[PDB]
Paper text:
Structurally, CD98hc is a type-II-transmembrane glycoprotein which is disulfide-linked to one of six known multi-pass CD98 light chains (CD98lc), all of which are permease-type amino acid transporters with different specificities 3, namely Lat-1 4, Lat-2 5, y+Lat-1 6, y+Lat-2 7, asc-1 8 and xCT 9. First, it acts as a molecular chaperone for membrane trafficking, stabilization and proper function of the CD98lc 10, 11, thus boosting the transport of amino acids and contributing to cell survival and growth. Second, CD98hc directly contributes to intracellular integrin signaling and is involved in integrin-mediated cell to cell interactions via cellular adhesion molecules, such as VCAM-1, thereby influencing cell growth, survival, spreading and migration 15-19. Anticalins constitute an emerging class of artificial binding proteins obtained by combinatorial design based on the compact and robust human lipocalin scaffold 48.
To identify the epitope region and to understand the structural mechanisms of the tight molecular interaction between P3D11 and the CD98hc ectodomain, we crystallized this lipocalin variant in complex with hCD98hcED (carrying an N-terminal Strep-tag II) after isolation of the 1:1 complex via SEC. Crystals belonged to the space group C2, with two complexes per asymmetric unit, allowing collection of a synchrotron X-ray data set and refinement of the structure to a resolution of 1.8 Å. The engineered lipocalin binds to a membrane-distal part of hCD98hcED via the four variable loops #1-#4 at the open end of its β-barrel. The β-barrel axis of P3D11 is tilted by ~45° with regard to the TIM barrel axis of hCD98hcED. The contact interface between both proteins involves a buried surface area (BSA) of 1473 Å2 (1424 Å2 on the side of the lipocalin and 1521 Å2 on the one of hCD98hcED) as well as 15 hydrogen bonds and 3 salt bridges, resulting in the largest interface observed for Anticalin•protein complexes thus far 71. The interaction is favored by electrostatics as P3D11 is positively charged, which complements the predominantly negatively charged epitope on hCD98hcED, also reflecting the calculated pI values of 8.8 and 5.2 for P3D11 and hCD98hcED, respectively. The epitope of hCD98hcED essentially comprises two loops, L1 (residues 128-137) and L2 (374-404), which follow on the first and the eighth β-strand of the TIM barrel, respectively. Almost 75% of the contact interface is contributed by L2, which penetrates deeply into the binding pocket of the engineered lipocalin, while L1 contributes approximately 20% to the total BSA. Interestingly, binding of P3D11 causes an induced fit on the side of hCD98hcED.
Numbering used by the authors:
A (entry chain B): 114 to 529
B (entry chain A): 7 to 178
């Protein structure tokens, strides 16, 4: 019964050429990366846009035709059938003026909206699993158009998804978009650029859930940009642990799994960096790409960001409490954010996050939770974000001490 | 996919003078199969500094503007078989490791240079060509000479990009 997009992470690929790196940068090349994508346990890919768009020219934009530099309609149908065999879903980005400065054009809004409307049934017939539209701050009467497009997509099948993206970070603006659209999945800047205290992140997360009836939602730092656009390297591991264990669908962009940072090499486009598969990525700068920046190098190191991403994604896509669970937060100290995930009679998870730069005792208070919950004296450590602890062994909960920037994931069974 | 050219198609600058090639070069053009394209953001310009050492190696420093600060990376180019060819030093000896060849194709030392790069990883080869300038801008004619050579090695013109000049960091 549970909808497919509830079952794990979504993975955005906006620039097909930069993702592939080598060769031609087409739909065929993407198909040859599906074994890698399956290794990440991601449940859906968000692709493109890939349609014909003469920059700023409404008449020479056609959402029904693939731009021949990306490949053919036969290459697209082959990509969909191979993704299906690997249990990976496919979402098509239809943002119409993707090659221009304004994504929605500057004129003829009724003509532009009709292009999106008329492309929905065409692509659902081809076998896509849903759609993404971005930059909806620039779309006039967005809440009405989104309701219409949702009703067409769900009318085809309740197992089809519409994702909307906005640059907004404002709670009131987001609430007014969703008021008549309560089931839409929305990505936004709600969590980016508010300074990062443990207490402030706890306030953002709790107030959002309290305002929206604990309904299903996404968790992300942006509608499109990399985590390293917003966060220093020392908080990346902590944020991945939080995103994979909050109640909702986590959404990443290509390279987030290796900590891809556009600033870390000479010559990377700041908003669309080349994916670093191995040390041969940029042959014109010998010595610049080190092994620890790359997919090949990170796959050989149990302590890497990619190894952590893979483990967390595994847990998110198999543990019923992380799939379906309720959520309750503690009010821990300055520096800390801590919470529990729990469902019916399945294994429970405790998450403890130290956002600060000093070592801390957690002194978690049981009475912060509702009367009917309770904690055991000890819980088995599943993992830490930092090396050197004994996994699989119990830790005593009244006594936890966390190092600077450390996150812990603990587990405990259903006891009646 | 575009296969690497044989090294027998790649010219070597005659009579190469290592002491004239030293100093700062701006990366004015980049041609290869990396994902960069003429129809989209080509990136910000960076500099490559060649410091000649007593054993005829170069210490090579890359200088660029990162998020809100200047950024640096350093490596050693070890002389190869002929004057004007180099390899990358301080490389691992595990059997899957990447190796490099650098060949200076054409330079007048005080204005422009074209350099060819080849990587080898297991059985797989990668390549690029760079257009260097002593200044951040070069003439239409010199850029066309670089376009013509890159195309002769099998690259489409849309695989050739010209990074945007900036003033942060790259002018010491």
């Amino acid at each position: 019964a549970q909808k497919w997009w509830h079952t794990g992470a979504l993975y955005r690929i906006g620039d097909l050429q930069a993702f592939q790196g080598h060769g031609a940068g087409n739909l065929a090349g993407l198909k040859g990366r599906l074994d890698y994508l399956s290794s990440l346990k991601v449940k859906g890919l968000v692709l493109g846009p890939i349609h014909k768009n003469q920059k700023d020219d409404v008449a020479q934009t056609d959402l029904l035709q693939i731009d021949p530099n990306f490949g053919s309609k036969e290459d697209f149908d082959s990509l969909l059938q191979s993704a299906k065999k690997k249990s990976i879903r496919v979402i098509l980005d239809l943002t119409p003026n993707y090659r221009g400065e304004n994504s929605w054009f500057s004129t003829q809004v009724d003509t532009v909206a009709t292009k999106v409307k008329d492309a929905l049934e065409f692509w659902l017939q081809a076998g896509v699993d849903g759609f993404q539209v971005r930059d909806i701050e620039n779309l006039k009467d967005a809440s009405s158009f989104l309701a219409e497009w949702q009703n067409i997509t769900k009318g085809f099948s309740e197992d089809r998804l519409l994702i909307a993206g906005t640059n907004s970070s404002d709670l009131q603006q987001i609430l007014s978009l969703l008021e008549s659209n309560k089931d839409l999945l929305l990505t936004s800047s709600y969590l980016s650029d508010s300074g990062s205290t443990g207490e402030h992140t706890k306030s953002l997360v709790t107030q959002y859930l309290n305002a929206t009836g604990n309904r299903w939602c996404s968790w992300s730092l942006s509608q499109a940009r990399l985590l390293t656009s917003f966060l220093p390297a020392q908080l990346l591991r902590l944020y991945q642990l939080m995103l994979f264990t909050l109640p909702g669908t986590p959404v990443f962009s290509y390279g987030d799994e290796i900590g891809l940072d556009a600033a870390a090499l000479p010559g990377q486009p700041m908003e669309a960096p080349v994916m670093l598969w191995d040390e041969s990525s940029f042959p014109d700068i010998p010595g610049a790409v080190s092994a620890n920046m790359t997919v090949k190098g990170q796959s050989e190191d149990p302590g890497s960001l990619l190894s952590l991403f893979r483990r967390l994604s595994d847990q998110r896509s198999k543990e019923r409490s992380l799939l379906h669970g309720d959520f309750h937060a503690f009010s821990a100290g300055p520096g800390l954010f801590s919470y529990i995930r729990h469902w019916d009679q399945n294994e429970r998870f405790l998450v403890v996050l130290n956002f600060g730069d000093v070592g801390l005792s957690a002194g978690l208070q049981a009475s912060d939770l509702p009367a009917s919950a309770s904690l055991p004296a000890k819980a088995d450590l599943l993992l830490s974000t930092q090396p050197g602890r004994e996994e699989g062994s119990p830790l005593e909960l009244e006594r936890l001490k966390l190092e600077p920037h450390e996150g812990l994931l603990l587990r405990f069974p259903y006891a009646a | 996919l575009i296969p690497a050219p044989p090294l027998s198609k790649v010219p070597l600058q005659q009579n190469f003078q290592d002491n004239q090639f030293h100093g700062k070069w701006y990366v004015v053009g980049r041609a290869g199969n990396t994902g960069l394209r003429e129809d989209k953001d080509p990136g910000k310009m960076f500099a490559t500094i060649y410091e000649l050492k007593e054993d005829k190696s170069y210490n090579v420093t890359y200088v660029w503007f990162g998020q809100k600060k200047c950024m640096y990376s350093i490596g050693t180019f070890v002389p190869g078989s002929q004057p004007g060819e180099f390899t990358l030093g301080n490389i691992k000896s595990a059997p899957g490791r990447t190796s490099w060849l650098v060949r200076v194709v054409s330079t007048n030392y005080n204005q422009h240079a074209m350099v060819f790069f080849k990587s080898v990883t297991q059985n797989r080869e990668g390549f690029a060509i760079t257009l260097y300038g002593r200044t951040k801008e070069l003439t239409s004619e010199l850029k066309e000479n670089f376009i013509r050579f890159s195309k002769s090695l099998g690259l489409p013109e849309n695989h050739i990009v010209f990074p945007v000049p900036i003033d942060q960091c790259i002018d010491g």
